[PDB]
Amino acid sequence: PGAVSTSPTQSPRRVQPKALKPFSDMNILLLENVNATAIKIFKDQGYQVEFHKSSLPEDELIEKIKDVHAIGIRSKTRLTEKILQHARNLVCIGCFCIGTNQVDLKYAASKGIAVFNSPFSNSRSVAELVIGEIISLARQLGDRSIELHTGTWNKVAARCWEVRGKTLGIIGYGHIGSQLSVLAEAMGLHVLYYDIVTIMALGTARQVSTLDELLNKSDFVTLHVPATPETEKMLSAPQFAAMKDGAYVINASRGTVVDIPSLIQAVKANKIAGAALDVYPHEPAKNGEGSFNDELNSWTSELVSLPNIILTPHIGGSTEEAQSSIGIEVATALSKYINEGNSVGSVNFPEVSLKSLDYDQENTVRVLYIHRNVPGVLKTVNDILSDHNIEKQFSDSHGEIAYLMADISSVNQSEIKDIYEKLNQTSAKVSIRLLY
Amino acid sequence: SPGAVSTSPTLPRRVSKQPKALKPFSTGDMNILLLENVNATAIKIFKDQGYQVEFHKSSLPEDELIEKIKDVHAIGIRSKTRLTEKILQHARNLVCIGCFCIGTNQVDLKYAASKGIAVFNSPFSNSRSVAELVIGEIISLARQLGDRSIELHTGTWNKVAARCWEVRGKTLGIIGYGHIGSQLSVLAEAMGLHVLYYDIVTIMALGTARQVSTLDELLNKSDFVTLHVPATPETEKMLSAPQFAAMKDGAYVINASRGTVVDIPSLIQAVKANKIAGAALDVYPHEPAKNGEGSFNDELNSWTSELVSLPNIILTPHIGGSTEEAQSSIGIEVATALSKYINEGNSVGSVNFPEVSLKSLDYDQENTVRVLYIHRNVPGVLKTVNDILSDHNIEKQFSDSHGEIAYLMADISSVNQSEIKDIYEKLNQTSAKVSIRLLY
Amino acid sequence: AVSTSPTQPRRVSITKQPKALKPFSTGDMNILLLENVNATAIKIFKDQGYQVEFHKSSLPEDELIEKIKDVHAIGIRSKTRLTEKILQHARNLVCIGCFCIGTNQVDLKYAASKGIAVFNSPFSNSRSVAELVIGEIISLARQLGDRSIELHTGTWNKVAARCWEVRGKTLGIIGYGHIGSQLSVLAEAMGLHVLYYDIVTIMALGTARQVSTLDELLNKSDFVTLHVPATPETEKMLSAPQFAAMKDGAYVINASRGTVVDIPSLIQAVKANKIAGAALDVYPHEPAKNGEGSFNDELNSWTSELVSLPNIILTPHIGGSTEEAQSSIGIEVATALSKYINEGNSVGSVNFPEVSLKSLDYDQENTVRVLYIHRNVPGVLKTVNDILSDHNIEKQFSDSHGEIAYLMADISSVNQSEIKDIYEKLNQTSAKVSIRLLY
Amino acid sequence: PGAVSTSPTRRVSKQPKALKPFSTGDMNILLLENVNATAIKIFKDQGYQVEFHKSSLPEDELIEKIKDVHAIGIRSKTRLTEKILQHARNLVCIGCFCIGTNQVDLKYAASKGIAVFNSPFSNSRSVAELVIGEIISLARQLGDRSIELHTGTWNKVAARCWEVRGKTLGIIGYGHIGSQLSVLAEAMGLHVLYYDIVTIMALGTARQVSTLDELLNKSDFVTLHVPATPETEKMLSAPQFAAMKDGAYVINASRGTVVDIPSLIQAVKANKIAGAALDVYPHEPAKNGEGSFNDELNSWTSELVSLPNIILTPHIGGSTEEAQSSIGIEVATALSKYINEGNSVGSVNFPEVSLKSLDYDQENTVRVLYIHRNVPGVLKTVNDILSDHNIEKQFSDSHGEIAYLMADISSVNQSEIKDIYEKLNQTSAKVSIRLLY
Ligand SMILES: NC(=O)c1ccc[n+]([C@@H]2O[C@H](COP(=O)([O-])OP(=O)(O)OC[C@H]3O[C@@H](n4cnc5c(N)ncnc54)[C@H](O)[C@@H]3O)[C@@H](O)[C@H]2O)c1
Ligand SMILES: NC(=O)c1ccc[n+]([C@@H]2O[C@H](COP(=O)([O-])OP(=O)(O)OC[C@H]3O[C@@H](n4cnc5c(N)ncnc54)[C@H](O)[C@@H]3O)[C@@H](O)[C@H]2O)c1
Ligand SMILES: NC(=O)c1ccc[n+]([C@@H]2O[C@H](COP(=O)([O-])OP(=O)(O)OC[C@H]3O[C@@H](n4cnc5c(N)ncnc54)[C@H](O)[C@@H]3O)[C@@H](O)[C@H]2O)c1
Ligand SMILES: NC(=O)c1ccc[n+]([C@@H]2O[C@H](COP(=O)([O-])OP(=O)(O)OC[C@H]3O[C@@H](n4cnc5c(N)ncnc54)[C@H](O)[C@@H]3O)[C@@H](O)[C@H]2O)c1
């Protein structure tokens, strides 16, 4: 009838390293008003920081970047071949943001320049926004507050709903989708999610096989997808046709993923009761007045005349929490690459690291040798280092570039200069630093 | 020794005799009048009882109401329809009044009670709708959503993260830890907020909230301050200049309680001085009585012009309980309450009447009759009634007094169709009688 | 369409302080407590003004009859039998406290016919039984008892074979009542899947699942525990066919009733290597006192065979035998008597009509409470309400339990003079069983 | 004035390449001391040939058996000395299916390029559950109750019998076991305090206490989850028992040495300690046996076993089917990844070295596993020998006098393999070389 047998095998934080210095104080340039957390991390390392609140014109940048060891940018400052080619001293680039398209990664890598970003530091800020907007759409808060500001009193309960017992449809169950799932359940929503992949539910959310089943059974539909050919305009006339009468659409994902004119048709036809958009096919480049208009997007005027539409200026990760933790994530990443040669989490460089050295390891030196990925190079380097015990050593390749880290013992101030000069003279060399 | 090991200090729902369906000795079918667009849930409950329902979406003029209420057994109103002696005095048949709302002031309770007319309301069925609103507004204030959406609608793009905060790790100060305060406490903890609460009573925390001894400790340590208090002399203008002075630089004020409890001009000063970073108000010292355009202006409240000038103020027209869920559960709560008073004489939860009920009778208790005798609260009346019913075993009996009115319910066995008519006529002829119904 | 959802803190009570009522013709109240009732009961009774006589033992029928002549309330446990023979001499007895679950040691029907209200504590033992079952699940899983018996005789036997970690295992709970449900939550916390069978549909706590047949439970369970009442349908409800339906190497725990398991079948199943272990707290026949040669083949024919077996925990009805349980029995039952003696509250009584009224405000000077227990016949309310008719009855509640009935009335504007009159008149009525006045 | 301030701050996923050794005929595994069937299944599913025994082996038959063996699994009883490891031509790695490694000459094994693995933490849940069972059992005197009725005594007693809910558990050592116990104990409704020589972040709502003396003062049950160090030696003795509550309880499933049994016995005799559960004693029998636990082994045995409400267990804290089976998986997996990929992470005698697996489609990539003497010049030689191929990547680490290089090299055809093996095999510093292709 059965037997008692072995259960299936299941499936805290607690409280001395050597401070390494380069043979060459380092100079950091921070643009586009990076958070003060980044600034404090860099100053506490001894580094000299130059801080600006704006991007710089191509002219002043080329002048500034000549003598700089690390630069922090956001989405606005373009680092092209044109401007990176004058960067004699540049060790690494910090992108205090998710995007890296504003940097010529291929070129940066070929000069031995490591690039870091913060891809996931914004998840919580977007999830909270969507909760706020579910409630705000449910209750038509925006409309109520606009009315009373113009002096109109319109106390309405009709089609104004409580969120408890309603269905949230999450399209894309990723970093943000999943954090949202848990908040939504805590606010008493049933969570369905469609994804092109099978994913393990958090809490008591249920994965649905087709988009059509989600749109059919959902009161609120929210999008948390990347920009791909398949996500392009993936919500359009036929999707809105498949949704419940008086259902709600929220998009804080990508400007392209929803067909705004179809949305506008659906809202006009009383099929969709509300929408919140944080992202649009075309967005201003700077902040300012009459930026959001029919020159930018043809339907801007038509949308601004609809009831119960929340429109936001791409502010999903626009919190002090998000900016400060981007500051820490990226300043830490640079700080460990400059101080230890740690390239883990870089988007353009081979990923390489070694355990820190004890305070007690006098006269150990760390070789950071970026080089062309061809046969013969380790032969040369390990020949040059032959007079010293290599405690340990790690090399990895990323296409046509490669990165060796080596720890060598019994090196006096004299022998360092010798080893630098020899490694500097090698055929395959792209960049060499010694940490001492 | 450092003490001794000694004694520590100290069910789920189960599906578990059918009740007897009790008919009035009134041959006439019951007539329900529902005004002011009571929810369809109420209508359904009444029709399924057999009752005849007349439904209006508006109040009625005093003329048509007096005509209509002559032959009505139960009336449902909301806050608009005033039931005064003037109009209740013509109500021959009226058993009970339903207030499908929190307020009972629209009704002359004292007068209604003296005619044996029981009044019921729904005090608490709006709690969840208010708690959800406050969560929405904490986030909306934290992120300046309203301002962002107003900007982009006029064509201004202003992407700002300065003065924008993730609610996680912030402190919610709840003033009044009642029905709404407590439901808010749980939602706030789930959204990752620390909860403090001040209350003039000691109350057991839900989740991991902590009660604080003084208002001033709450104001000092809170990022968002929300009010969930009644309108009393002590709550009148209890948030003013000195309270805002005690609050954190860049803290937020939410008032969805009573329009008297906050001094709007002091808050306007505090917002102007960059001491308060945002506010959401659902309630005001003076509110329009109808919905309309240019209702919310300086004739009604002097500061309107300045208030609506400010950044990051959410203004709402008393919409805290304005949901379909809230209205529908008001429908069930109040229609059920009337239905049990009409069918069983249950007066528990009534606001103008003694609170009296008895266990239902089993389906198989043939020839048991229930006496519902509303009467003047004076000596001798139980003596009379229990004399009139001495030829019968009283299975059980409950009488309570509320001022000058009192309410006897009695279950009596071994009564045939003959003896019912006798008992009605006798009780109907008594000196203290205000109202008698028999259920069989 | 988007449509309407389906419909879905204790505080210091600032009330007007209640009025403390005293008895009228009574000088003082005498409580007799037998069978070593907890000190919590003693404290509650002394704080009420009552005079307490405390014994650690039952009393011989001789000394008891002498003692209960002049007694207002008696507290017993399971041993002291209160028969017609001994209750017939009880002139003054207002109420009986059973500081335990059982009320069979009392002649309830007789007690009721003399107007004597009986109270018990049915559910104050739940947590003590649930914890015991957790301890025993682990102890059986790991064969602790056997290991410790071995080493005490000097034998070292490190064994891992068919010793298990409870996490991942299935607890089958038969009877999802007060104990069943508390056990459910502890079991899930110790990482067990919980199934439960019950003859009623019941809402699961946590992530337990109710199963439609007993046989599904027995099939899918590693540990089967019973928390069921003693009924004709629970009698030997685990027998050969149930053990046959259980997993090879599954475990049986009975801390419910002595009759619910067939021990000869259990013994067979353990002998046939079908059942790997059992814990019994209850047996069809139990000693009456504690003693050294009590648990033997005279008491139960299979004892020598049962005690022969490996990995069987035998315990002497200690399911509820904790300091916590005894002390909270003390509070529950002493409170219940205290409120019946002081306020006439009969709610939770096992032999009387359930009747109470809201307390009176402190400032209701000259309001008196009539407690009139009487024969459930026509005309008695007529008489009483006649006797009271010179006074406003603020409120009044009468309920009937077969042939006995209980009226409580609050009456205003009564001076010390009119009290004596009203007592004497109610005392003289034909239907009267007992009358007290509180003022 | 104050100021609002910044807060503090499941998916299925390129198949791997299955790498074969260059000069192997079949892999031979020897498993001793009745290793769990989970290990056996993992090895058979790799293709390996498995020989399984339920007992340790005599030194004679072992030396014969280990000549031709690629991997051996032992537990604590088998002793792998220089004497017996010196005959092991083909031995790649040793599996300790247990927490102990002292039964192995680690230093010697390392110097021959023999990697040793264990399962240090596989037992944590089994020990935590035992302590829960024993807290309840001591609280209620279950053992005594069951011993009484078995002798025919009926003794229904509630005195000094307690419910655990509302009682205080003092955990000494908030490690792998301490921390799992913390969560179970809270769920059973105990307050948890813990002392540790390190500051550690509480799970749930447990509170770390500064001194041992505060723990002993405020605790109803004291349980020990520490390693064997000079500081833990007899750390519970007369003065600690003096500091504990009248009628408190002591549980030791840590190490045989950490409690002074004489003082415990005095404290129990004086009615200061109401009960104790011991799983570990300073001296323990060597086999299971019927007269083993006595005054020859520990002078206090006859006195200890006299006492009421003392649970005595035979080191059964990690004696469950679950624990043995997950030791099976942990250690068989560890060997399997070392044999198949050269992964040495979690090894106790060898350097810790690993690389990402290779994609299925990387034909003619070869992995060099070169164990060697930790001296200058060796990487120079090896990287010279390999210089006619692109090194995709390469990792070398040293552990004292031994060191371990892993390299991935591309564009290697069936011919060039034999050349590279022979050259690496001929180098002065070489201790062991395998090629995977
Ligand atoms: N509004 C903002 O300011 C802001 C800020 C941060 C992130 N985002 C954006 O939001 C999106 C989601 O963010 P994330 O970090 O959680 O992403 P993610 O990488 O964690 O997950 C994306 C999910 O989408 C799923 N997916 C991909 N294509 C799909 C399709 N066609 N249909 C359904 N599911 C599909 C993937 O399986 C994955 O689960 C991204 O585009 C991200 O850049 C916006
Ligand atoms: N916005 C709306 O549409 C709407 C809807 C429903 C309720 N409300 C109002 O909001 C309030 C909350 O209603 P509720 O059901 O939660 O009330 P409640 O009676 O359940 O709780 C009120 C709490 O306030 C506390 N309290 C009273 N005076 C206090 C004071 N001076 N300071 C601190 N604590 C004090 C009480 O102890 C109690 O805990 C009421 O005034 C109610 O009328 C508004
Ligand atoms: N061992 C002890 O010292 C001790 C102490 C307390 C209680 N108990 C006994 O344990 C039992 C459980 O106690 P409780 O307070 O939880 O009782 P309870 O009344 O709360 O629960 C009993 C449950 O059994 C269910 N049930 C009844 N007949 C059934 C049947 N034949 N099959 C399955 N389910 C059935 C009922 O529906 C109910 O859910 C009782 O017999 C009680 O006297 C023993
Ligand atoms: N009974 C058994 O069969 C069995 C099974 C497994 C483990 N164990 C033993 O149990 C112990 C705990 O195992 P674990 O995995 O939790 O170990 P662990 O290393 O994870 O934790 C030990 C903890 O003790 C602390 N500690 C060390 N010295 C201390 C001192 N003097 N005072 C207080 N705290 C101190 C450490 O800080 C650490 O947190 C070990 O000794 C282990 O061998 C026994």
| Closest ligand (CA of B181) | 2
Question: Tokens for D14?
Answer: 């390129």
How far from the centroid of its chain's Cα atoms is residue C417's Cα?
Answer: 43
User: Ligand 4: which of D172, D226, D330 to mutate, judged by most atoms within 8 Å of the beta carbon?
Assistant: D226
- The contact set of C with A (CB < 8 A) is 1-2, 4-6, 8, 162, 164-165, 167-169, 218-220, 222, 244-251, 276
For D428, phi and psi rounded to 5 degrees?
-70, -40
Tell me the CA end-to-end span of chain D in Å, nearest whole number. 70
User: Ligand 3: which of C198, C225, C257 to mutate, judged by most atoms within 8 Å of the beta carbon?
Assistant: C198
Q: Assess contact for C315 and C278: CB atoms under 8 A.
A: no
How far from the centroid of its chain's Cα atoms is residue B103's Cα?
Answer: 7
* Rounded-to-integer distance, Cα A170 and Cα A188, Å: 15
Minimum distance, in Å, between the CA of residue C382 and any CA atom of chain A: 55
Q: Which helix (H) or strand (E) holds D149?
A: helix D142-151
Question: Tokens for A76?
Answer: 């606005």
CATH fold label, D124-312: Rossmann fold (3.40.50)
Domain B361-440 part of CATH 3.30.1370.160? no
Among C286, C280, C285, C281, which Cα is nearest to C267's?
A: C280
Contacts for B89 with CB less than 8 Å, ≥ 6 apart: none
* Rounded-to-integer distance, Cα B116 and Cα B352, Å: 10
* D154 chain-C contacts, CB cut-off 8 A: 286-287, 290-291, 294-295, 316
Among D186, D180, D189, which Cα is nearest to D162's?
A: D189
Catalytic residue among D82, D315, D363, D422: D315
Tell me the CA end-to-end span of chain A in Å, nearest whole number. 70
B316 closest CB neighbour out of A144, A157, A313: A144
Taking the centre of ligand 2 as the mean of its atom positions, its distance from the CA of residue B228, in whole angstroms, is 4
What's the length of chain B?
Answer: 440
- State the Cα angle at B11 between B8 and B15, rounded to 5°: 175
* Rounded-to-integer distance, Cα C152 and Cα D307, Å: 10
Q: Assess contact for B190 and A183: CB atoms under 8 A.
A: yes
Domain B128-138+168-289+303-315 part of CATH 3.40.50.720? yes
Is the CB of D245 less than 8 angstroms away from the CB of B4? yes
What is the amino acid identity at position C410? D
Q: What is the CATH number of domain C15-125+321-352?
A: 3.40.50.720
* Rounded-to-integer distance, Cα D432 and Cα C301, Å: 72
Q: Assess contact for D167 and D221: CB atoms under 8 A.
A: yes
Q: Which CATH class for the A126-311 domain?
A: alpha beta
* Residue B290 DSSP class: S
Residue A227: C-alpha distances to residues A124, A128, A220, A231, C119 (Å) = 20, 22, 21, 6, 72
* Residue B310 DSSP class: S
* Rounded-to-integer distance, Cα D42 and Cα D34, Å: 15
Q: Assess contact for B174 and B194: CB atoms under 8 A.
A: no
Beta strands in D296-417 (DSSP E): 310-312, 366-373, 391-399, 402-409
Q: Assess contact for A76 and A32: CB atoms under 8 A.
A: yes
Q: Assess contact for A348 and A114: CB atoms under 8 A.
A: yes
Residue with tokens 């027209």: B317
CATH fold label, C132-138+166-287+294-314: Rossmann fold (3.40.50)
Contacts for B435 with CB less than 8 Å, ≥ 6 apart: B115, B116, B372, B373, B374
Minimum distance, in Å, between the CA of residue B14 and any CA atom of chain C: 4
* Rounded-to-integer distance, Cα B385 and Cα B407, Å: 12
Minimum distance, in Å, between the CA of residue D196 and any CA atom of chain C: 25
Annotated active-site residue C55? The verdict is no
Question: Tokens for D212?
Answer: 């041992």
What is the amino acid identity at position A408? I
Which numbered atom of ligand 4 lies nearest the CA of D130? 1
D393 closest CB neighbour out of A202, A376, A395: A395
Q: Which helix (H) or strand (E) holds C264?
A: helix C263-271
Contacts for B263 with CB less than 8 Å, ≥ 6 apart: B237, B239, B240, B241
* Rounded-to-integer distance, Cα C83 and Cα C110, Å: 8
- The contact set of A with C (CB < 8 A) is 1-4, 6-8, 10, 159, 161-162, 164-166, 219, 244-248, 273
Which numbered atom of ligand 3 lies nearest the CA of C318? 3
Residue D365: C-alpha distances to residues A282, A404, D336, D358, D391 (Å) = 47, 20, 20, 8, 9
Contacts for D421 with CB less than 8 Å, ≥ 6 apart: D22, D23, D433, D435
Chosen CATH of A18-122+319-349 out of 2.40.50.180, 3.40.605.10, 3.40.50.720, 3.40.50.300: 3.40.50.720
Minimum distance, in Å, between the CA of residue B84 and any CA atom of chain A: 26
Among A364, A387, A377, which Cα is nearest to A428's?
A: A377
* Residue B372 DSSP class: E
Residue with tokens 């089609």: A159
Q: Assess contact for D156 and C286: CB atoms under 8 A.
A: no
CATH fold label, D362-437: Alpha-Beta Plaits (3.30.70)
For C196, phi and psi rounded to 5 degrees?
-145, 135
Other CB atoms within 10 Å distance of the CB of residue D401: 12
The structural architecture, per CATH, of the domain C357-439 is: 2-Layer Sandwich (3.30)
Give which of A319, A323, A326 to mutate to test B binding, by max B Cβ within 10 Å.
Answer: A319
Evaluated on CA atoms B135, B139, B144, B149, the torsion sign reads negative
Among D296, D411, D309, which Cα is nearest to D362's?
A: D411
Is the CB of A162 less than 8 angstroms away from the CB of B295? no
Contacts for A396 with CB less than 8 Å, ≥ 6 apart: A350, A351, A352, A402, A403, D392, D393
How far from the centroid of its chain's Cα atoms is residue B58's Cα?
Answer: 21
* Rounded-to-integer distance, Cα D127 and Cα A5, Å: 19
Is the CB of D396 less than 8 angstroms away from the CB of A392? yes
Q: Residue whose CA is closest, atom 28 of ligand 2?
A: B229
Resolution in A: 2.7
Is the CB of D142 less than 8 angstroms away from the CB of C145? yes
Is the CB of B167 less than 8 angstroms away from the CB of A292? no
Taking the centre of ligand 4 as the mean of its atom positions, its distance from the CA of residue D173, in whole angstroms, is 6
Among C80, C71, C73, C76, which Cα is nearest to C37's?
A: C76
Q: Assess contact for D344 and D351: CB atoms under 8 A.
A: yes
Is the CB of B314 less than 8 angstroms away from the CB of A141? yes
Cα radius of gyration (chain A): 27
Taking the centre of ligand 3 as the mean of its atom positions, its distance from the CA of residue A66, in whole angstroms, is 84
Q: Which residues of D6-40 are buried (b: 16+ CB within 10 A; e: fewer)?
A: bbeeeeeeeeebebebeeeeebbbbbbbbbbebbb
Number of Cα atoms under 13 Å in the Cβ half of residue C390: 8
Contacts for C372 with CB less than 8 Å, ≥ 6 apart: C384, C406, C407, C408, C409, C426, C432, C435
- State the Cα angle at B16 between B14 and B21, rounded to 5°: 140
Contacts for A332 with CB less than 8 Å, ≥ 6 apart: A41
**DSSP character string of B120-168:** E--SSTTHHHHHHHHHHHHHHHHHTHHHHHHHHHTT-B----TT---ST
Minimum distance, in Å, between the CA of residue A208 and any CA atom of chain C: 19
Query: Is B361-440 in the same CATH topology as B19-126+323-353?
Result: no
Q: How many CB pairs under 8 A join B and C?
A: 116
Q: What is the CATH number of domain A357-436?
A: 3.30.70.260
Taking the centre of ligand 4 as the mean of its atom positions, its distance from the CA of residue D255, in whole angstroms, is 8
Is the CB of D162 less than 8 angstroms away from the CB of C321? no
Q: Assess contact for A71 and A65: CB atoms under 8 A.
A: yes
* Rounded-to-integer distance, Cα D407 and Cα D416, Å: 16
Catalytic residues of A: 254, 283, 314
Q: What share of chain D is helix, strand, coil (3-state, %, to 5)?
A: 30, 20, 50
How far from the centroid of its chain's Cα atoms is residue B384's Cα?
Answer: 38
Number of Cα atoms under 13 Å in the Cβ half of residue A249: 30
Sort D89 into a burial class: Cβ within 10 Å, 0-12 / 13-18 / 19+: exposed
Residue with tokens 């509480």: D202
- Helix extents (H) in D219-367: 238-243, 261-269, 301-304, 321-341
State which approach was used to obtain the coordinates.
X-ray
Q: Which residues of B396-424 are buried (b: 16+ CB within 10 A; e: fewer)?
A: bbbbbbbeebbbbbbbbbebeeeeeeebb
B390 closest CB neighbour out of C202, C382, C394: C382
Q: Which residues of B15-47 are buried (b: 16+ CB within 10 A; e: fewer)?
A: eeeeebebebeeeeebbbbbbbbbbebbbebbe
Question: Tokens for A339?
Answer: 């101080």
How far from the centroid of its chain's Cα atoms is residue B399's Cα?
Answer: 26
Q: Which helix (H) or strand (E) holds C218?
A: helix C214-220
Q: Which helix (H) or strand (E) holds A81?
A: helix A81-84
Question: Tokens for A353?
Answer: 């690291």
Annotated active-site residue D255? The verdict is yes
Taking the centre of ligand 1 as the mean of its atom positions, its distance from the CA of residue A224, in whole angstroms, is 4
| Closest ligand (CA of C320) | 3
Taking the centre of ligand 3 as the mean of its atom positions, its distance from the CA of residue B134, in whole angstroms, is 45
Other CB atoms within 10 Å distance of the CB of residue B171: 19
Q: Residue whose CA is closest, atom 18 of ligand 2?
A: B178
- State the Cα angle at D436 between D434 and D437, rounded to 5°: 145
Q: Assess contact for C1 and A245: CB atoms under 8 A.
A: yes
For C322, phi and psi rounded to 5 degrees?
-125, 160
* Rounded-to-integer distance, Cα D411 and Cα D390, Å: 8
Residue C151: C-alpha distances to residues D14, D253, D281, D305 (Å) = 56, 15, 12, 8
Taking the centre of ligand 4 as the mean of its atom positions, its distance from the CA of residue D215, in whole angstroms, is 17
Catalytic residue among C72, C257, C374, C391: C257
Q: Assess contact for A396 and A334: CB atoms under 8 A.
A: no
- With H, G, I as helix, E, B as strand and everything else as coil, classify residue C230: coil
Helices D124-140 and D142-151 pack at an angle, to 10 degrees, of 60
- With H, G, I as helix, E, B as strand and everything else as coil, classify residue D28: strand
Residue A340: C-alpha distances to residues A20, A361, D405 (Å) = 7, 15, 22
* A9 chain-D contacts, CB cut-off 8 A: 322, 325-326, 329
Is the CB of C138 less than 8 angstroms away from the CB of D160? no
Catalytic residue among C286, C298, C354, C424: C286
* Rounded-to-integer distance, Cα B207 and Cα B209, Å: 6
Q: Assess contact for A4 and C166: CB atoms under 8 A.
A: no
Instruction: Domain ranges for chain D, please list them.
Output: 14-123+320-349, 124-312, 362-437
Sort B251 into a burial class: Cβ within 10 Å, 0-12 / 13-18 / 19+: buried
- What CATH superfamily classification does B19-126+323-353 receive? NAD(P)-binding Rossmann-like Domain (3.40.50.720)
Among A338, A412, A435, which Cα is nearest to A22's?
A: A435
Among C117, C67, C60, which Cα is nearest to C90's?
A: C67
List chains adjacent to chain B, taking adjacency as at least 3 C-beta pairs closer than 8 Å: A, C, D
Q: Assess contact for C302 and C294: CB atoms under 8 A.
A: no
Taking the centre of ligand 1 as the mean of its atom positions, its distance from the CA of residue A175, in whole angstroms, is 8
For B129, phi and psi rounded to 5 degrees?
-65, -35
- State the Cα angle at B380 between B378 and B383, rounded to 5°: 140
Which numbered atom of ligand 1 lies nearest the CA of A224? 12
Catalytic residue among D61, D163, D231, D284: D284
* Rounded-to-integer distance, Cα B416 and Cα A145, Å: 65
Among A132, A221, A135, which Cα is nearest to B167's?
A: A132
Question: Tokens for D286?
Answer: 């060597």
* Rounded-to-integer distance, Cα C192 and Cα C173, Å: 12
Sort C241 into a burial class: Cβ within 10 Å, 0-12 / 13-18 / 19+: exposed
* C148 chain-D contacts, CB cut-off 8 A: 143, 311-313
Residue A143: C-alpha distances to residues A155, A160, A275, B159, B354 (Å) = 11, 12, 12, 21, 45
Number of Cα atoms under 13 Å in the Cβ half of residue A349: 31
Q: What is the CATH number of domain D14-123+320-349?
A: 3.40.50.720
Q: Which residue of B has its CA nearest to C390?
A: B379
* Rounded-to-integer distance, Cα A408 and Cα A393, Å: 9
Cα radius of gyration (chain C): 27
- With H, G, I as helix, E, B as strand and everything else as coil, classify residue B34: strand
| Closest ligand (CA of B15) | 3
Among B123, B20, B97, which Cα is nearest to B395's?
A: B20
Contacts for B66 with CB less than 8 Å, ≥ 6 apart: B87, B90
* Rounded-to-integer distance, Cα D318 and Cα D335, Å: 22
* Rounded-to-integer distance, Cα B100 and Cα D60, Å: 94
